[PDB]
Amino acid sequence: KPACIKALTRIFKISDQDNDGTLNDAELNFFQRICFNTPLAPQALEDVKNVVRKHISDGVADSGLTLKGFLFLHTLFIQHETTWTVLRRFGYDDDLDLTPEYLFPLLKIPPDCTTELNHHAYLFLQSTFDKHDLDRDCALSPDELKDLFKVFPYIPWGPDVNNTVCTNERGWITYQGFLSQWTLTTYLDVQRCLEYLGYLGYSILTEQESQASAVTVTRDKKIDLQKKQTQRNVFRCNVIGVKNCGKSGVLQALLGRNLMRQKKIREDHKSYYAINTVYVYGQEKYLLLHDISESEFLTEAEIICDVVCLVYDVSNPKSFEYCARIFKQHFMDSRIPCLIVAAKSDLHEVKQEYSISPTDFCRKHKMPPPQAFTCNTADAPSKDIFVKLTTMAMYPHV
Ligand SMILES: Nc1nc2c(ncn2[C@@H]2O[C@H](COP(=O)(O)OP(=O)(O)CP(=O)(O)O)[C@@H](O)[C@H]2O)c(=O)[nH]1
Ligand SMILES: [Cl-]
Ligand SMILES: [Mg+2]
Ligand SMILES: [Mg+2]
């Protein structure tokens, strides 16, 4: 029984689309249709409300069904089969748990293909954000996130999510940052995104066969390279360099954060990812950065990307050798574009101990010139390199 109440309470929360605490006639009729194929007459609906009002006082607020009122009607129909109709319609099984078919619809992704949310999927998330942004500040406070996750069986996002997407003045995920996190999750872990969409009741509220009906599968990367044109909107860039060469500073710069703001980031909440929108020649795209920590190996995983960002420290004389090394053993004869970034360029430039200068190296292997970059500036860092990286990802040849 307590398991039954738990499910119905969630089903209520999902059905309350405007998230006001009641099921108005608009939302109530929607619920009846998806469950019982036919809604009730406008005043025959008012008759049911009367039955509620004449038993409990807190069962009907405004002229819409409250949760207590909703749970009350569940008891009335028993003292059956009406409830199980509702439960099964919302993905629950006999054990009152969400079925694998509902939460994990199989979506086999072809090799060298990526996953994006379609336009209607984004719209669903845009409304989803608005429903829980009750303070209208275009950001989700910790309370507004707890509210959003009350349809989730566990907390899906950790405190590092705030160091991955755009946040506001107080570290709260903004409206744009919110969509960036979903864009990010969909790209890296589509099965997790589909699971999360199930918790939000996407498949039901949008009346579609599965959560998978929100994901777009882009074509083979090889075809994009051969046809020299892509339709993708999300591009992944791997950031590679020695330890403490300023990689994390590059990632956080994409989020618009100064170096001084970065020093207040606790390591418990550290993130090796950063995602944001970038405009390339009037086209809006998503740039996805992945901080690759200096390890003994570089597998076939940390090399798959649309563009590589080799970062070295100008105050570190031995740092650029790493860039030259990694480039020569993974990206020298690769169809992946590479951009060298001279990070910490606010510091005094020290002569690199490598055999050849960064400048000449970029000519020997036909790359763009080493880009000067710093996150240690007043206001927010420059988005120049991020436009560059995205541009090279979109047009590898040009
Ligand atoms: N002056 C200055 N210092 C910087 C800049 N970027 C980073 N730093 C400093 O350099 C150090 C290393 O930066 P960080 O971004 O953490 O490097 P990292 O390569 O991510 C470290 P790891 O390899 O372990 O991930 C920090 O002390 C940071 O404050 C910059 O543009 N200017
Ligand atoms: Cl559900
Ligand atoms: Mg409502
Ligand atoms: Mg808010």
Author numbering: 182 to 260, 264 to 582
From the paper:
Human Miro1 and Miro2 (hMiro1, hMiro2, also called RhoT1 and RhoT2) are MOM protein homologs that play a critical role in mitochondrial trafficking38394041424344. Both associate with Parkin upon mitochondrial depolarization and are ubiquitinated on multiple lysines18374546. Here, we demonstrate that the cGTPase domain is necessary and sufficient for efficient ubiquitination of either hMiro1 or hMiro2 by p-S65 Parkin. We also find that despite considerable similarities between these two substrates, Parkin modifies hMiro1 much more robustly than hMiro2.
We determined the crystal structure of hMiro1 amino acids (aa) 177–592 (hMiro1-BC), encompassing the central EF hand region and cGTPase domain, to 2.5 Å resolution. Similarly, structures of hMiro1-BC bound to either GDP or the non-hydrolyzable GTP analog GMPPCP were virtually superimposable, with GTPase Switch 1 positioned far from the nucleotide-binding pocket in both cases. Thus, the structure of hMiro1-BC is highly evolutionarily conserved and, in isolation, appears to be conformationally inert with respect to ion or nucleotide binding. We tested whether different ion or nucleotide conditions might influence Miro ubiquitination efficiency by p-S65 Parkin. Using ion or nucleotide exchange protocols similar to those used to obtain crystal structures of hMiro1 constructs in different divalent cation and nucleotide states, we were unable to detect a change in hMiro1 or hMiro2 ubiquitination. This result suggests that neither the divalent cations Mg2+ and Ca2+ nor the nucleotide ligands GDP and GTP directly regulate Parkin-mediated Miro ubiquitination.
